[PDB]
Design a protein around this motif. Structure first.
Motif, PDB file in Angstrom:
ATOM      1  N   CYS B  32      67.097  37.218 -23.506  1.00  0.00           N
ATOM      2  CA  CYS B  32      67.061  35.799 -23.837  1.00  0.00           C
ATOM      3  C   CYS B  32      68.361  35.396 -24.533  1.00  0.00           C
ATOM      4  O   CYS B  32      68.639  35.847 -25.648  1.00  0.00           O
ATOM      5  CB  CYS B  32      65.859  35.503 -24.727  1.00  0.00           C
ATOM      6  SG  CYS B  32      65.632  33.770 -25.068  1.00  0.00           S
ATOM      7  N   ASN B  33      69.147  34.547 -23.879  1.00  0.00           N
ATOM      8  CA  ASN B  33      70.394  34.027 -24.433  1.00  0.00           C
ATOM      9  C   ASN B  33      70.149  32.636 -25.005  1.00  0.00           C
ATOM     10  O   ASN B  33      69.484  31.806 -24.379  1.00  0.00           O
ATOM     11  CB  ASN B  33      71.507  33.958 -23.371  1.00  0.00           C
ATOM     12  CG  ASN B  33      71.954  35.334 -22.892  1.00  0.00           C
ATOM     13  OD1 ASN B  33      71.333  35.921 -22.010  1.00  0.00           O
ATOM     14  ND2 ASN B  33      73.039  35.850 -23.468  1.00  0.00           N
ATOM     15  N   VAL B  50      73.635  33.722 -29.369  1.00  0.00           N
ATOM     16  CA  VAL B  50      72.643  34.702 -29.797  1.00  0.00           C
ATOM     17  C   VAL B  50      71.904  35.222 -28.574  1.00  0.00           C
ATOM     18  O   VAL B  50      71.547  34.449 -27.676  1.00  0.00           O
ATOM     19  CB  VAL B  50      71.666  34.073 -30.806  1.00  0.00           C
ATOM     20  CG1 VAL B  50      70.581  35.088 -31.251  1.00  0.00           C
ATOM     21  CG2 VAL B  50      72.447  33.498 -31.974  1.00  0.00           C
ATOM     22  N   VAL B  51      71.672  36.534 -28.547  1.00  0.00           N
ATOM     23  CA  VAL B  51      70.972  37.206 -27.460  1.00  0.00           C
ATOM     24  C   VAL B  51      69.857  38.074 -28.047  1.00  0.00           C
ATOM     25  O   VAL B  51      70.047  38.768 -29.056  1.00  0.00           O
ATOM     26  CB  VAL B  51      71.955  38.040 -26.605  1.00  0.00           C
ATOM     27  CG1 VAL B  51      72.663  39.081 -27.472  1.00  0.00           C
ATOM     28  CG2 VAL B  51      71.235  38.712 -25.445  1.00  0.00           C
ATOM     29  N   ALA B  52      68.685  38.029 -27.419  1.00  0.00           N
ATOM     30  CA  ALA B  52      67.530  38.804 -27.853  1.00  0.00           C
ATOM     31  C   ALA B  52      67.000  39.599 -26.674  1.00  0.00           C
ATOM     32  O   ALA B  52      66.777  39.043 -25.596  1.00  0.00           O
ATOM     33  CB  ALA B  52      66.415  37.909 -28.421  1.00  0.00           C
ATOM     34  N   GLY B  57      62.925  38.828 -27.109  1.00  0.00           N
ATOM     35  CA  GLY B  57      63.454  37.800 -26.223  1.00  0.00           C
ATOM     36  C   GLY B  57      62.367  36.950 -25.595  1.00  0.00           C
ATOM     37  O   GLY B  57      62.527  35.737 -25.436  1.00  0.00           O
ATOM     38  N   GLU B  58      61.241  37.570 -25.234  1.00  0.00           N
ATOM     39  CA  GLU B  58      60.148  36.785 -24.676  1.00  0.00           C
ATOM     40  C   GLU B  58      59.559  35.849 -25.723  1.00  0.00           C
ATOM     41  O   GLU B  58      59.247  34.695 -25.419  1.00  0.00           O
ATOM     42  CB  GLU B  58      59.069  37.696 -24.080  1.00  0.00           C
ATOM     43  CG  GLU B  58      59.629  38.814 -23.204  1.00  0.00           C
ATOM     44  CD  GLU B  58      58.588  39.417 -22.263  1.00  0.00           C
ATOM     45  OE1 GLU B  58      58.174  40.581 -22.482  1.00  0.00           O
ATOM     46  OE2 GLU B  58      58.224  38.716 -21.290  1.00  0.00           O
ATOM     47  N   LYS B  95      73.622  39.833 -31.610  1.00  0.00           N
ATOM     48  CA  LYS B  95      72.452  40.458 -31.016  1.00  0.00           C
ATOM     49  C   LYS B  95      71.325  40.421 -32.048  1.00  0.00           C
ATOM     50  O   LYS B  95      71.477  40.942 -33.161  1.00  0.00           O
ATOM     51  CB  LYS B  95      72.760  41.884 -30.555  1.00  0.00           C
ATOM     52  CG  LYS B  95      71.716  42.416 -29.556  1.00  0.00           C
ATOM     53  CD  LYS B  95      71.904  43.882 -29.164  1.00  0.00           C
ATOM     54  CE  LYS B  95      71.902  44.796 -30.392  1.00  0.00           C
ATOM     55  NZ  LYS B  95      70.951  45.976 -30.313  1.00  0.00           N
ATOM     56  N   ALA B  96      70.217  39.772 -31.704  1.00  0.00           N
ATOM     57  CA  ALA B  96      69.177  39.534 -32.694  1.00  0.00           C
ATOM     58  C   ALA B  96      68.227  40.715 -32.780  1.00  0.00           C
ATOM     59  O   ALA B  96      67.816  41.285 -31.763  1.00  0.00           O
ATOM     60  CB  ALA B  96      68.386  38.268 -32.378  1.00  0.00           C
TER      61      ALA B  96
END
Lengths: 106, 102, 105, 106, 99, 102, 105, 99
Positions: B32-33, B50-52, B57-58, B95-96
């Motif tokens: 997830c961006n 931010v990227v998860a 991310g979901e 990166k989270a």
DNA sequence: TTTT
DNA sequence: TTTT
DNA sequence: TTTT
DNA sequence: TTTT
DNA sequence: TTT
DNA sequence: TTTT
């Protein structure tokens, strides 16, 4: 009272001696390359070292303090904020940490 | 190896500039961006990529929309790539690892 | 340049309405009780309570805008002050001295 | 497909310290063999000095006591915790410590 | 007012080793003791005494001493190298009798 | 004549329904999670609740009787002894010798 | 289940030597006088010593064990239950009926 | 801070009648109760509670209420008309929980 | 004393 | 995870 | 009680 | 580019 | 692009 | 009646 939080905390070693330049205003600007070294152990038992390189920039008195005390290899702590500056043949961007606090860790 | 050899920590509170984008790898892992604005007052904004990964991310793509106030804790990561002019160009993400919806 | 690092970061909810007192010299001082809630599974909810103090203009902004239940973000430093009781037993209390605050509602 | 909880934090309780130990770490063991290391840490500023009770469990606390000594420079990341007790006047009393989750010997 | 629960431990046994005394930043005594209780096998208990009670424990009890404790059960948690939540149970002492 | 004293007295409320099992011999083992709720009043007038959580275990007919008359929420009295068992990890628990449903 | 809780915890010293008797059926009945001592400092600075006396009785083997191992002045732990026995003269004595006993000397 | 004796009573049972609450000339509350504890025989205990504890007993407890007490044993004496010393044992309640 |  |  |  |  |  |  803040309207946001933008905070970076780094502890690492410099990769080169700090560089000092001055703006058109006469204000000091110190550019530094910092490595943060993370090392974990994988499910196979290897020690995997992973380095991340950061562009840290210090302004005014703090940059002057950085340029004098720090050297290539110095272990150092930084607190700062993320910002992406533009520059130029055409336009390109860089994300850097603008230091707000620095501590020499030797 | 329980001692840390460095520290690379980011803490962000701000608002999403657009709805999250969620994709999957061939193996099905979620990425997830998101684009996060952090505001400071002088009226100035800063934008963060931010990227998860994984479930984090979901959960982001389901709970957050444009304008959502959100807290992230992560680490800085720079990726490099080469353009058509063969120059090496860099791109930095957060990166989270943790998220609060607020 | 820093000679040490002493940094606390809290996101939680106020346990009660903030109290605003004044020092002898007139400086505002806002004491607040903040709950941070953590959750993990074996659904275990374990709160930690923090006394948070905000001085001067920032103390006044907390007293005015924050209420019991408010979600709030604090950044501060850990410090342990002394005080007195019924007798002259010195009593000690660790509290977070606030440096930034963001109302989150 | 199905999990026990969501992956969203319910709050933040984060302490970051760099300082010097006032004394050698104290290491003890529970009846079950679990290690508990208590340390007293000074953080300095300008001269002013705050003292923190830091506690480290398990192999992290053993590592603390094997590497760190009086005056050692050290970085801690942990959480704030208050535990209470009753004195002989039957008044509830509080003592706050920092439970360490990360340590870097500096 | 009225109590809303009861959490009470009564122990008589003998200390496994000498008490250990430490002080918090503020000057509060914390005394840790390991106590053995014997039955007709042997159970070991971690006993902690705060404040003056802790000081008196450390002054009066030694390894092998027979002692009576009244206290309450308390569990603390911590996270290990593998990020698992772990638990440690101790008896926080409220009364002590040297016997 | 007793060679030592190892007594625990608890009044609390169960945090979940009792969990009943049987040994190979057909002997019931009833595991329960009990919350003892203490409440004091502090200097600033807050009434403070501090909860402690205990692992209570009951064997035989008493274990069968706990799984029978007690649910999540049941207020209950327990008398028992402290034990630490292995499983290499350790848990301190209260092995019940008396029980009373309130 | 228990239907009730009736429990007494006592640590103190015997005021005299245990007296042993047997019922018509042959059951040992050992009667003991136990002093529990309580000290506190009052508001006037005096260290106030008080003393409560209890009638403790043990039956069966435990009574014979009490009669054998305990003397006057012995320090002892007792766990038991309260009982009020009547006896004509009609009188009532409240006593502690030992269930557990530990010799502390 | 070290105890020199232990005098501890723990009761769970049912009241025999309603609590009787009175006040001393100074205004201090004293609540006297009759508590039944059952074994399946029934034991009766005079419980007495002072101060606000006695008031909370009088306000919340009724004839058949199930109640928990913690307290200490204490025996008072008196002289009957045959000049015999007579004894009366009560439980002075220090803690109470309504069930 | 908070919040979900 | 309970309870007021 | 550490540090500069 | 650093550093263990 | 958010707020 | 004990005990410190």
């Amino acid at each position: 009272m803040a309207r946001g939080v933008n905070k970076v905390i780094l502890i690492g070693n410099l990769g080169d001696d700090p560089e000092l330049r001055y703006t058109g205003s006469g204000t000091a600007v110190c550019n530094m390359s910092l490595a943060t070294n993370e090392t974990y152990t994988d499910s196979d038992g290897n020690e995997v070292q992973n380095t991340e390189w950061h562009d840290v920039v210090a302004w005014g008195r703090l940059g002057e303090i950085c340029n004098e005390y720090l050297d290539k290899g110095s272990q150092v702590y930084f607190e700062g904020k993320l910002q992406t500056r533009s520059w130029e043949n055409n336009t390109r961007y860089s994300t850097e940490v603008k230091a707000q606090e620095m501590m020499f860790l030797d």
